[PDB]
């Protein structure tokens, strides 16, 4: 039941988008450089 990826801390989008891509029922993830939230 991966729904936090807490162990993903200090990791990288690689393993993130990778595994995160499913775990739950295909729960994906938005890869962004922090920045603001679209104006």
């Amino acid at each position: 039941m991966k729904t936090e990826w807490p162990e993903l801390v200090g990791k990288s989008v690689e393993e993130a988008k990778k595994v995160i891509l499913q775990d739950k029922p295909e729960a994906q993830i938005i890869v962004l450089p922090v920045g603001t939230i679209v104006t």
Binding site: L8, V9, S12, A16, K17, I20, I30, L32
Partner: peptide, 24 residues
């Protein structure tokens, strides 16, 4: 909400997941 398939995965300078995603 529901099982949205997206999570604000913010990255650092060298892509260092400094923020943990959850989707829950």
């Amino acid at each position: 909400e529901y099982r949205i398939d997206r999570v604000r995965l913010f990255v650092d300078k060298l892509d260092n997941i400094a923020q943990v995603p959850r989707v829950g």
